[PDB]
Design a protein around this nucleic acid. Structure first.
Lengths: 82, 97, 101, 276, 101, 209, 188
DNA sequence: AGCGGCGGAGCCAGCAGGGAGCTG
DNA sequence: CAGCTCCCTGCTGGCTCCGAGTGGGTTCTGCCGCT
């Protein structure tokens, strides 16, 4: 769907928060370039948490509607719960 | 086992002094597996023939001898579940036994 | 007990406490009473677990879609909003409607 | 007096597995007006609902061979003053159940005449003598036919009440929800304690279709019967109520989310989708 | 008019209901955060309460959309919570009970 | 036994008239809620061999939008109505320019008549009802919520709004009492307005199959 | 290992069945090779009503008790009733025993009853004199072994079977009460 | 020696029996 | 009008189900014989 027609919630649900964090910290573990300057922490999960808090994760979420359509929500663009 | 009929599993009133009320497994064998009381003893069986010859000589009648005319007022004797005869005087035969 | 004895001691009432101890009749009656609960504890599981599994296998694919509606595995609509309000069950409270009565 | 309502896991099974034959099907019949207020009209409604066969009212039954109906082998001046087959039938009722259920020999005789036609004539003693007699002949396989029709008439005749409802209870409810609730002129709720009556059978349709019976509030505790009588949406609400009754009977709480979801997925196809 | 809707929704009137956020408890939390001291006249204007509740009702969306089918669905899905919100964030109630600034 | 039968027929007429009002047919308030005394004075208190007899106590009504489609109801004297005792009603169906009607039988209708009612259904959409079934208006019951029949344009609006196809909705079988009460074919969804103890009012849609 | 006691009559009443009361006496000789040959004497649960049948080992269908007695050797009817109701001045017993009597007023002699039993046997004989021998063997050895298996034990078997029927009637009239299955007097 | 033969509870299918209904 | 056809209802027999895991132990995996 186009950017005008977005009917899903602007809040990043707990499942999206869990899976985005997991799949981004996995990328950090495979030596993907970090999007946020770190202060010496070495754990990829904490690195991914910091990126999520700073809203810099280079990932977008495809929300499949029941009819078959989908919406592309950028992680930076929707509200994080915590 | 694993049956929803709890009636067999329940502690029956006739378990007094012959089956331990407390002792039973807590699993799917509650009340089905039961131990034995302390002084509870299980009979081992013997021949009823001496009891039969003792019975037939006081005042009782075998089935073949009497007619059912006098069978209603008297009492029916069972030995190991088989109807042996008929006696006019239940008392003083109970005392004799 | 004498025949046809409907008195409290003859039918299971225990006038003694756990301190004074139970007279042997009362001990046997209490054992027989607790045996019922012990049997029920074992018997109830084979029905309750089966009920739980049967409930789960009938609803295991019912979920809230991104349309905010509730649909089963074949996209048949069960509720237009979850709980007919669209709200999570873990973030609600008990409240009182002041304007009522 | 009727707390054999089988709550708990058995009721949960009877609801989940939607069973044609629940162990305790029962009504919660409410009353409309002055019958809900006083006990006598409540009893009048009660007797019209409680099923009654002619076994309930008779003491003993006997058959004789009277050569002449005029002869009156039994000394009864009522037949003498009242007066074609010689083999007759005689049944003795009792005053107790008779005056408990408010019947008459005329009503019983007209029930017999309607059920069997003019194949037999009932000669009933008046409601004046201490003895309650009605004699039966057969107008013109001779007496065993009379024996069989006697058995058939004792087994099922429905003198009063409706079928399949065996015993009906009557009491004033204490819980506010089961009590009638109104709104006064000053916007109160004024919990009213009116007469209700619960059964042990279920019809749900011959009951509501009765005079002085409230056809707005009578639930039947029977999911299949509710499906047959009121429809699938009323089934969802009644099923929700009965499913919440067992959970809240313990005092425990389960959020309405889950009850609504279960009652929806069980009734989202237009038919009673029992979970089996 | 909301009162009659509540009275028809809840026969055998029971004010106990399940709702998302404890409005009374949040009012009491604000009272302690901002040191209301309800012994003095409040500066909160009564029309501000009404025009803030009306805007909050718009902000609290369950069914998104603008067509009348979506408006009716949103209104029905938020009806009970909106009734409670209006019954607790009253002009009179805020002026004489909570005294919030 | 005529007071009971008169009361029964009065309640049957009242329920049928309420059914017509809910279905959409034009009925005056005077006939909508008349007491038992008006029925007595207008029909005659004597259902057994008297003037309040069936067949000329039947009701004909018309829809509000246009007085072209008309709906009779028929109360056959026969307990178990048959083909020969409904072919007369069908002959009336044809001799009038009417399209549909009701039959409130006394006892169960015969399977041959049921199969007929199935067979001429597309030409004449007529259905049956029971004497027992119409002594109470089931919609008045507390368990039965508010059912509203959708028109085709708003059905299409609903489907376009929710982006779901026709068979994904919750459905209702045409044989259940509420759908039979309104009188509605398959492929016709019904608004169902019910109160929610969680959030106020809840709207659900049941499709007929 | 627990088990129900043998050679004793138990009158039960199962809830949902074609018959209301049923009296069983599983029987064993003094540790014979034959297993527990269990015989049930039952009463139907509702014309005439309350007929008494007795499903027999190695017999596919239930057999009315009066036919069993006539096959056992009692041609008359007074003699049969002398083995069931012990006091003829009790008409309540007669009123419930006559519905079973009028069921079998077409068998009057021993051989036709033997044929009737043999027709219901698991191994139906092709000729009359084969069913006669098969049913005679069944009555001689299969039914009630504990009361005796010898040349002439018909009178003793008839007395015990009439006692079983009398026990069933006592439970039907309520003169006595139903025996308890969990009563460990009834267990061995 | 190596293998060759010698209990209980609750939904569907299926028949049996009995009315409407058409036809000579 | 009496006899034949058909559809429904009622009743009986049949099939499948019967909590979640966990630790041990035990015996048993054919024998006779006959070429």
């Amino acid at each position: 769907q186009a950017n005008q027609k977005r009917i899903t919630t602007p809040y990043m649900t707990k499942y999206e928060r869990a899976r985005v964090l997991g799949t981004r910290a996995l990328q950090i573990a495979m030596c993907a370039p970090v999007m946020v300057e770190l202060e010496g922490e070495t754990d990829p999960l904490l690195i991914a948490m910091k990126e999520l808090k700073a809203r810099k994760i280079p990932i977008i979420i495809r929300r499949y509607l029941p009819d078959g359509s989908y919406e592309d929500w950028g992680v930076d663009e929707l509200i994080i719960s915590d | 086992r694993d049956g929803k009929l709890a009636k067999p599993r329940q502690l029956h009133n006739t378990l007094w002094g012959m089956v331990c009320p407390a002792e039973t497994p807590e699993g799917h064998a509650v009340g089905l597996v039961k131990n034995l009381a302390l002084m509870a003893y299980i009979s081992v069986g013997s021949q009823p023939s001496p009891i039969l010859e003792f019975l037939e000589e006081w005042s009782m009648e075998n089935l073949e001898e009497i007619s059912p005319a006098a069978i209603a007022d008297a009492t029916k004797i069972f030995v190991n579940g088989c109807w042996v005869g008929i006696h006019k005087d239940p008392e003083q035969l109970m005392n004799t036994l | 007990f004498i025949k046809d004895d409907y008195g409290p001691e003859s039918r299971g009432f225990v006038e003694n406490s756990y301190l004074a101890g139970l007279t042997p009749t009362e001990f046997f009656f209490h054992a027989m009473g607790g045996r019922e609960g012990l049997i029920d504890t074992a018997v109830k599981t084979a029905e309750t677990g089966y009920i739980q599994r049967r409930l789960i296998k009938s609803m295991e694919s019912v979920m809230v879609k991104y349309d905010a509606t509730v649909r089963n595995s074949i996209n048949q609509v069960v509720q237009l909003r979850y709980g007919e309000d669209g709200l999570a069950g873990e973030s609600v409270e008990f409240q009182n409607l002041a304007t009522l009565k | 007096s009727a707390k054999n309502v089988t709550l708990g896991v058995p009721r949960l099974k009877e609801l989940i597995n939607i069973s044609k034959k629940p162990k305790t099907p029962s009504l919660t019949v409410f009353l409309l007006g002055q019958s809900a207020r006083d006990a006598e009209r409540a009893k009048d409604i009660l007797c019209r609902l409680e099923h009654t066969t002619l076994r309930k009212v008779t003491a003993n039954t006997a058959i004789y061979y009277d050569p002449n109906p005029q002869s009156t082998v039994v000394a009864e001046d009522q037949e003498w003053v009242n007066v074609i087959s010689p083999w007759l039938l005689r049944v003795e009722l009792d005053r107790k159940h008779m005056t408990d259920r408010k019947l008459t020999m005329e009503q019983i005789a007209e029930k017999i005449n309607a059920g069997f036609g003019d194949d037999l004539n009932c000669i009933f003693n008046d409601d004046n003598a201490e003895k309650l007699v009605l004699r039966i002949r057969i107008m013109n396989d001779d007496d065993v036919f009379l024996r069989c029709i006697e058995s058939n008439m004792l087994t099922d005749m429905t003198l009063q009440g409706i079928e399949q409802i065996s015993k009906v209870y009557m009491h004033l409810p204490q819980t506010d929800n089961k009590k009638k609730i109104i709104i006064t002129e000053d916007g109160e709720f004024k919990a009213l304690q009116e007469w209700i009556l619960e059964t042990d059978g279920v019809s749900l349709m011959r009951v509501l279709s009765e005079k002085d019976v409230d056809p707005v509030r009578t639930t039947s505790n029977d999911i299949v019967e509710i499906f047959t009588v009121l429809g699938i949406e009323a089934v969802r609400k009644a099923l929700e109520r009965e499913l919440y009754h067992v959970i809240s009977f313990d005092g425990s709480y389960v959020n309405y989310r889950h009850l609504a979801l279960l009652c929806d997925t069980m009734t989202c196809r237009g038919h009673l989708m029992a979970i089996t | 008019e909301d009162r009659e809707v509540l009275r028809v929704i809840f026969p055998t009137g029971d004010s106990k209901v399940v709702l998302p956020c404890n409005l009374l408890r949040m009012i009491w939390n604000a009272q302690k955060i901002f040191h209301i001291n309800p012994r003095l006249p409040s500066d909160l204007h009564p029309i501000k309460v009404v025009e803030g509740v009306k805007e909050l009702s718009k902000k609290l969306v369950i069914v998104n959309g603008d067509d009348p089918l979506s408006r009716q669905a949103q209104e029905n899905a938020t009806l009970l919570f909106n009734i409670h919100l209006r019954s607790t964030l009253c002009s009179r109630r805020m002026a004489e009970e909570f005294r919030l600034s | 036994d005529d007071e009971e039968e008169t009361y029964r027929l009065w309640k049957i007429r009242k329920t049928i008239m309420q059914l017509c009002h809910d279905r959409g047919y034009l009925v005056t308030q005077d006939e909508l809620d008349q007491t038992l005394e008006e029925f007595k004075a207008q029909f005659g208190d004597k259902p057994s061999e008297g003037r309040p007899r069936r067949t000329d106590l039947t009701v004909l009504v018309a829809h509000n939008d246009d007085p072209t489609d008309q709906m009779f109801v028929f109360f056959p004297e026969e307990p178990k109505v048959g083909i020969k005792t409904i072919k007369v009603y069908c002959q009336r169906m044809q001799e009038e320019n009417i399209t549909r009607a009701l039959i409130v039988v006394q006892q169960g209708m015969t399977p041959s008549a049921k199969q007929s009612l199935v067979d001429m259904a597309p030409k004449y959409i007529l259905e049956q009802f029971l004497q027992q079934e119409l002594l109470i208006n089931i919609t008045e019951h507390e368990l039965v919520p508010e059912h509203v029949v959708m028109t085709k344009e708003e059905v299409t609006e609903l489907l376009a709004r929710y982006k779901l196809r026709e068979n994904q909705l919750p459905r209702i079988q045409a044989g259940d009492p509420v759908a039979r009460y309104f009188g509605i074919k398959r492929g016709q969804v019904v608004k169902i307005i019910r109160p929610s103890e969680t959030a106020g009012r809840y709207i659900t849609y049941r499709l007929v199959q | 290992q627990e088990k129900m006691a043998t050679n004793t009559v138990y009158v039960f009443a199962k809830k949902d069945s074609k018959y209301a009361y049923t009296g069983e006496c599983r029987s064993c000789l003094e540790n014979s090779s034959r297993p527990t040959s269990t015989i049930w004497v039952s009463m139907l649960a509702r014309a005439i009503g309350q007929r008494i049948v007795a499903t027999l080992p190695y017999i596919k269908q239930e057999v009315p008790i009066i036919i069993v007695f006539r096959a056992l050797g009692f041609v008359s009817d007074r003699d049969i009733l002398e083995h069931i109701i012990y006091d003829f001045e009790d008409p309540e017993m007669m009123e419930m025993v006559k519905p079973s009597l009028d069921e079998a007023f077409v068998i009057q002699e021993q051989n036709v009853a033997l044929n009737f039993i043999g027709s219901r046997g698991a191994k139906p004989g092709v000729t009359k004199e084969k069913r006669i021998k098969y049913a005679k063997e069944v009555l001689q050895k299969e039914m009630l072994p504990h009361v005796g298996v010898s040349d002439f034990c018909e009178t003793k078997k008839a007395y015990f079977l009439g006692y079983m029927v009398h026990r069933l009637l006592l439970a039907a009239l309520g003169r006595r009460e139903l025996d308890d299955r969990d009563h460990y007097g009834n267990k061995r």
